[PDB]
Amino acid sequence: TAEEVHARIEFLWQREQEKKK
Amino acid sequence: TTDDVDPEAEYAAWKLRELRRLRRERDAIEARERELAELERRRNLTEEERRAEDEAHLAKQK
């Protein structure tokens, strides 16, 4: 449930970090 | 839409907002408190005086 959301949100955050690069 | 730009000014503005909130809320608390208080003393003093107050406000309008 919420844990899946955790993994998704982490993926999103790392993606944003990649964007800022 | 940048959240962390100019920390000091944003904190100040927020402080103004929160102050507005607590001020209106405290105004509320003190207001209903003083109304319920006035009305309570009004019950407590005596029945005759309660009658004098009601008769007074009815006389004022009516």
Binding site: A2, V5, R8, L12 | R17, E18, L19, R26
Partner: protein
């Protein structure tokens, strides 16, 4: 006429939404493409991709904002409390509009005490949001949005169910009076005056 599983608030998901606005949501193309078969994580994705602002309705077209559409999908889904709490916490530390969504949702589906208790500490949050009203896009803030949720009958083009007033809960002593990050008014006044005169000389 039958009722689907009821929200902790005690109201079925359909009734709290007005017919016009919800049908307006269903009719929208954006809703038809983005709101079909959406898992919680997927709604998180749709959020972080497509929501740049908050509103119930926008323009003469009366097109529903993505915020309200995803709010409606979340409403239909009726997710459990723990995962939405974790949702607003984590997503919130990462992004604001997610917090706005979860907050609106909780205001919809949850009882008074719960809503108060969980929303009130977020009055500390000052993060800036852009809100599209009926006319123009006025700038607003997270704390202002929360305060609006608590003190306003209608928010985001959705009527808000009459909430038991907080001071009533105070007199019944179910809950302790709200405490700001700052202290009481008088002590703030005195310490600010003292700090001002001290810094000044």
């Amino acid at each position: 006429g039958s009722s689907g599983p009821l929200a902790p608030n005690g109201l079925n998901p359909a009734t709290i939404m007005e017919k016009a606005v919800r049908e307006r949501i269903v009719e929208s193309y954006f809703w038809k493409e983005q709101c079909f078969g959406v898992n919680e994580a997927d709604i998180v994705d749709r959020v972080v991709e497509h929501v740049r602002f908050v509103g119930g309705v926008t323009g003469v077209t009366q097109k529903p904002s993505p915020f309200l559409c995803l709010a409606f999908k979340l409403l239909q889904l009726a997710p459990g409390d723990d995962i939405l709490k974790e949702y607003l916490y984590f997503g919130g530390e990462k992004f604001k509009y997610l917090r706005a969504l979860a907050a609106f949702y909780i205001r919809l589906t949850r009882p008074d005490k719960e809503v108060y208790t969980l929303l009130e500490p977020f009055l500390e949050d000052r993060r800036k949001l852009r809100r599209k009203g009926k006319n123009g896009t006025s700038l607003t803030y997270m704390d202002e949005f929360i305060d609006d949720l608590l003190t306003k009958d209608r928010v985001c083009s959705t009527s808000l169910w009459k909430m038991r007033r907080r001071d009533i809960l105070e007199d019944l002593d179910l809950l302790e009076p709200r405490v700001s990050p700052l202290g009481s008014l008088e002590d703030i006044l005195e310490e600010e005056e003292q700090a001002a005169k001290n810094e000044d000389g």
